[PDB]
Amino acid sequence: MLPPDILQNGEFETIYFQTNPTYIKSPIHIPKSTIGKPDTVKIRHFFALLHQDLVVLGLEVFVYLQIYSDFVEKYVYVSKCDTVGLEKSTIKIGKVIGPVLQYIINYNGYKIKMKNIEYRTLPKTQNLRLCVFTKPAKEYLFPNSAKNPYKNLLNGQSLLRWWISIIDSITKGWNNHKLMIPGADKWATRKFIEKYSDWSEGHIFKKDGLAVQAIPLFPDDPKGRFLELVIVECRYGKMTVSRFYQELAYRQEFLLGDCVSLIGCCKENLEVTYHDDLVSTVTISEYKEFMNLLKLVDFSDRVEVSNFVSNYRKSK
Numbered sequence: 473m474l475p476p477d478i479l480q481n482g483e484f485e486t487i488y489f490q491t492n493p494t495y496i497k498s499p500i501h502i503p504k505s506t507i508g509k510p511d512t513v514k515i516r517h518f519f520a521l522l523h524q525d526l527v528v529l530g531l532e533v534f535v536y537l538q539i540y541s542d543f544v545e546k547y548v549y550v551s552k553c554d555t556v557g558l559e560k561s562t563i564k565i566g567k568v569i570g571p572v573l574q575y576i577i578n579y580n581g582y583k584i585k586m587k588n589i590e591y592r593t594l595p596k597t598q599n600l601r602l603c604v605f606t607k608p609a610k611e612y613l614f615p616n617s618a619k620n621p622y623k624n625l626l627n628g629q630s631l632l633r634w635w636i637s638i639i640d641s642i643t644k645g646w647n648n649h650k651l652m653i654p655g656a657d658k659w660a661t662r663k664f665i666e667k668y669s670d671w672s673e674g675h676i677f678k679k680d681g682l683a684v685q686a687i688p689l690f691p692d693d694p695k696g697r698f699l700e701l702v703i704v705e706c707r708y709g710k711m712t713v714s715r716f717y718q719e720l721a722y723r724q725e726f727l728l729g730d731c732v733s734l735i736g737c738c739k740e741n742l743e744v745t746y747h748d749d750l751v752s753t754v755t756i757s758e759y760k761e762f763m764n765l766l767k768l769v770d771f772s773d774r775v776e777v778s779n780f781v782s783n784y785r786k787s788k
């Protein structure tokens with residue numbers, strides 16, 4: 473997960489846990505009259521880097537397994553990425569995020585219960601989809617950290633360039649790498665990927681038909697937020713994929729936002745061997761309990777942060 477070469481005294485430690493794999497309804501609407509409907513299994517991943525008693529950064533990633541008879545459609549969605557900045561940075565954040573995200577993408581030791589003692593065996597063929605949105609904000613995970621002396625805030629274009637560099641380095645050889653900047657002319661979007669030969673403009677999802685049957689609705693995703701609206705306004709039987717992305721450009725979040733962007737990469741027909749890797753797994757309630765504790769900590773305050781960390785260590 474993390475290499476000793478970056479740093480290795482014992483100075484830094486990690487928080488890392490997953491939820492127990494949990495069946496959910498598909499984040500992509502599957503028509504009721506469709507054969508070979510897949511089962512969907514979701515796993516939440518939370519990672520934080522600690523230095524001494526302080527949190528340095530955090531990363532939340534959701535993995536969705538669409539399990540078919542002969543293959544898995546595996547979506548990896550970056551939920552949140554954030555830094556604290558209480559101390560002078562001794563390491564480049566991007567060089568921790570990359571490896572952790574790559575580990576999460578490639579993780580295949582999930583203990584999945586049978587669909588209604590005995591765990592389900594997944595198909596060996598997986599098709600990977602990596603989905604990342606870029607949107608600057610003062611804070612995503614760590615309340616009040618924007619006030620901190622060493623928190624570095626990237627503007628939207630800097631943030632996009634940062635994510636492109638990270639994602640490119642961990643998707644080497646993947647079948648595609650897609651960038652969309654809703655509302656931006658294609659020349660402006662092209663400029664971000666001119667030095668990335670394997671990247672092109674657009675998105676990774678099905679191009680035709682209804683948007684709701686092509687695009688996954690991920691939690692707390694600018695794309696998902698519009699999808700939700702389409703569904704509650706019952707425009708879901710009408711709006712195509714192309715029209716969805718056209719109208720997405722005019723959403724307040726995009727049109728008033730700072731280079732809000734959407735990245736998707738795919739790797740097709742990867743043969744995966746199930747590998748047992750023992751990590752801390754928790755119930756959803758335990759996971760949510762942790763996240764709720766998190767949102768109540770003042771991350772501008774060393775005392776509160778150290779206490780949070782102390783309290784976690786005594787737990788497990």
Ligand SMILES: CC(=O)SCCNC(=O)CCNC(=O)[C@H](O)C(C)(C)COP(=O)(O)OP(=O)(O)OC[C@H]1O[C@@H](n2cnc3c(N)ncnc32)[C@H](O)[C@@H]1OP(=O)(O)O
Nearest residue numbers: 553554555564565566605606607608609610622624625626
């Ligand atoms: C919606 C989404 O999923 S995207 C959301 C992204 N997350 C956020 O916006 C949360 C708020 N923002 C942040 O927490 C940060 O700005 C992050 C996480 C985006 C990046 O943190 P950084 O510390 O900037 O990462 P990193 O350590 O790699 O620094 C990256 C660049 O900024 C420079 N930098 C880092 N710290 C500093 C600093 N204190 N002062 C000046 N420059 C700095 C690095 O040298 C590097 O510059 P280079 O491009 O010349 O190498």
